[PDB]
Ligand binder design. Structure first.
Ligand SMILES: Nc1nc2c(ncn2[C@@H]2O[C@H](COP(=O)(O)OP(=O)(O)OP(=O)(O)O)[C@@H](O)[C@H]2O)c(=O)[nH]1
Ligand SMILES: Nc1nc2c(ncn2[C@@H]2O[C@H](COP(=O)(O)OP(=O)(O)OP(=O)(O)O)[C@@H](O)[C@H]2O)c(=O)[nH]1
Ligand SMILES: [Zn+2]
Ligand SMILES: [Zn+2]
Lengths: 449, 459
């Protein structure tokens, strides 16, 4: 069977079934989508793509379930469960669009404020398209899987409950005596899953940021116990130090990289260029029908051909219709970027919703600063991007008596404003607008400097 | 003074002049060319591009020249010198095309067997285009540089002696009393330059290969000293183990990555697709004039727009006349690859030249086997690539000058990996059925036989 050499995980080997699923247009697509979006334009080492990250998650997810398999035969973990948990880890990110979180996190909301679209939903849709276009279902059977049950199981591990929306068991892929398997790839009960392990390590490796955490140690000690009358994955608390190091790494990646000031301004410049190209860029989908960037999400055949390449198709275009789009991308290249105006956050735990994003620049230009001013700005002059986001929420067990649980800065939304007008006159105006806007919505007063 | 955080070199300080050269569509271009070409399709970590590597090289150049000057001020290395060496470090890979070494190493020779192309030549042409397109010359004067001379010096460091020659000091950009500045960015004489330091480290990082060479130790202890009344960069005797480790690193990278079996087959597959796309892809150059992939090198404005993107343009294309090209890239994705047939070497024989690459599949198909088979094979069925290391076969360790801490001005007179410039020759077959492959091998063995290449070694 096939072996890959990975800079994070060393020699990792892939079941033939996994290799079939990988060697496919729908999967290979992920080589053309930057893991960190415009982060590459700030971090020269962050060139990595959703593809290698996804091999990694498929591997770790395999390591975890198999570890629990050898260490606790009573759980009844089959080879069939390992494959399914591997496929889920392998495919969890198929849904990601051009520049990852930029796409479903900002661009689709600005382009079509009325559609409810997430990269996870897209993962399930893109996975359905993958198996249907490449005849995977008989190959699954050939290797022991039961498609009319396991495909649910794989989709569920990726998007959460399918028949959702109480206390009952929502899942159809596996029964509640195997509830813990749903915690491997994506898990909201913790900030702990094999996805995070991979991209924490991987992003650290490519960013040049210290990684404190050792997943390999956690898999050897982890095991399943009973907690509040269910099955959960538990840690030996001689590893609480390891857990703290993980969260410290998570906080560093967020402060230094994900919430980086220039990296995020560039993400909004790329979106701006995409918005101004949306009418003109063509992506051929199913049947020969042509789509737009903002609409390609409704056809998996077209979405398959929708990647970071759209950046260069715009950069390199000659069509006078795409000149505006072209121009913004060029300003990125000369590094004449949008200028930073300021930051604020809602008080308190009211989160601005994706469907309202587009209305925010209008709101900001509509503010009336106390002192009337020199320059007037318009809605278009402003960018508003919304940036989103203890160890006692973890279950622990004891080495001697290895049985059941032995359990006895912020915030959730940054709002930043940039101005496209660059002179000191207009930039002074913008800040005045912004400060008022923050009052008019009772957000925290911006801090100067 | 911008600071860039790099995963190999940590904080990298960039002088305003370097930043101006970087924020350029000519330089930014290098973000869209993978360092290892099709290596990425075999090594999932090998996503890195020519851009960040080039930042690494400019930085290393700056470190070495600065350290030489601060330790020996009698060399009169000015800050003007350092910037020039940095810029050379920075722009040395500007001329690379799609998928790096695949472009000038195979595609251009296959598409236009008669042209003499080289990414080094490319870099010099792209450097000029970058300067003139971006008003760089005044910005150079702003910081003490002399554009006429210093642009000439930067080009010499990239491509070598520009107007030569049959025995006189061949450069024009700096006089011989600063000869040691030309051994920084590229040194063919002893295989030690800062370009290699960066991609040794960077490729190991991305491939998951251990790099046992510490470039930091080497800079700490490097000195200019006199060798045959010409001033050279010298290592300390005590450092010799680090140097061995640098040549072992180099060797592992070639054996494990650059000469990877499957990674090179995919290279010839991408090249095949370009060849079949070449009549149909258009790239707008200077004056709205249009170029092919194979002629974009003749116009730097069009070349600027020629990157790995061309892979995706072919892949996503709907034009009926790109169907064949599409097909080959689709087979890469499905991983139905050209099948491997065998390897040989021209040991003792004249080496294969790029001008003759195109004629080789016809030679292989014309090398009728002695036992007869029911399967006949044509030229179109064969791929043959010629893989070169190739620094041209010498021993570069025998050209390292050492010095002792007791007599730091005199170079010590002094009398480990195996090959440094071997030409490998591999054939693949486009048909995959087991009888066609049995045939392809028979043609291959015959070809080697009468070409007097080494006999292939039992599957
Ligand atoms: N000029 C340049 N900087 C890069 C590049 N790639 C990464 N960087 C990094 O990203 C930063 C670019 O933004 P800055 O100019 O430093 O930020 P600033 O203009 O001072 O501040 P703000 O207006 O608040 O955003 C640099 O500090 C570098 O560390 C590049 O290609 N060109
Ligand atoms: N199947 C597959 N292997 C990959 C991939 N990416 C990297 N690899 C690695 O690259 C190496 C090359 O393997 P393959 O591409 O499958 O080569 P092959 O099976 O000999 O193909 P043929 O020449 O057609 O017989 C492998 O040893 C893997 O470690 C991928 O996307 N798919
Ligand atoms: Zn993920
Ligand atoms: Zn280089």
């Amino acid at each position: 069977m096939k072996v890959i050499n990975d800079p994070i995980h060393g020699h990792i080997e892939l079941h033939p079934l996994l290799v079939r699923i990988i060697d496919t247009p729908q999967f290979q697509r992920l080589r053309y989508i930057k893991q960190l979006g415009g982060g590459y334009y700030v971090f020269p080492g962050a060139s990595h793509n959703r593809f290698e990250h996804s091999l990694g998650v498929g591997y770790l997810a395999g390591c975890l379930v198999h570890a629990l398999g050898e260490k606790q035969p009573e759980l009844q973990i089959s080879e069939r469960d390992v494959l399914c948990v591997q496929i889920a880890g392998l495919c969890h990110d198929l849904g990601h669009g051009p520049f990852s979180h930029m796409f479903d996190g900002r661009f689709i909301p600005l382009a079509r404020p009325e559609v409810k679209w997430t990269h996870e939903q897209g993962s399930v849709m893109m996975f359905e398209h993958l198996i249907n276009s490449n005849g995977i279902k008989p190959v699954m059977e050939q290797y022991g899987l039961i498609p009319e049950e396991d495909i649910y199981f794989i989709k569920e591990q990726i998007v959460g409950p399918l028949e959702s929306p109480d206390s009952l068991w929502p899942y159809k892929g596996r029964p509640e005596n195997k509830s813990f398997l749903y915690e491997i790839v994506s898990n909201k009960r913790n900030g702990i899953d094999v996805d995070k392990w991979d991209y924490f390590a991987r992003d650290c490796h490519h960013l040049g940021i210290q990684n404190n955490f050792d997943y390999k140690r956690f898999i050897k000690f982890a095991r399943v116990c009973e907690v509040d009358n269910e099955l959960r994955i538990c840690a030996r608390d001689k590893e609480v130090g390891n857990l703290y190091d993980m969260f410290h790494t998570r906080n560093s990646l967020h402060r230094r990289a994900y919430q980086h000031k220039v990296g995020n301004i560039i993400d909004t410049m790329i979106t701006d260029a995409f918005l101004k190209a949306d009418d003109y860029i063509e992506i051929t989908g199913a049947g020969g029908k042509k789509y737009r960037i903002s609409t390609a999400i409704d056809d998996m055949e077209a979405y398959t051909k929708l990647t970071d390449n759209i950046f260069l198709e715009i950069l390199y275009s000659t069509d006078p219709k795409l000149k505006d789009a072209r121009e913004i991308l060029k300003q990125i290249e000369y590094r004449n970027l949008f200028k930073y105006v300021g930051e604020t956050q809602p008080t308190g735990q009211i989160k601005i919703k994706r469907e309202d994003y587009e209305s925010l620049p209008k709101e900001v230009a509509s503010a009336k600063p106390k002192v009337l001013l020199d320059v007037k700005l318009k809605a278009e002059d402003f960018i508003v991007d919304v940036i989103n986001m203890p160890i006692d929420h973890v279950s622990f067990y004891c080495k001697t008596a290895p049985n059941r649980a032995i359990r006895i800065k912020f915030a959730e939304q940054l709002i930043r404003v940039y101005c496209k007008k660059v002179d000191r006159k207009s930039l002074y105006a913008a800040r005045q607008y912004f400060v008022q806007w923050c009052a008019d919505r009772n957000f925290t007063k911006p801090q100067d400097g």
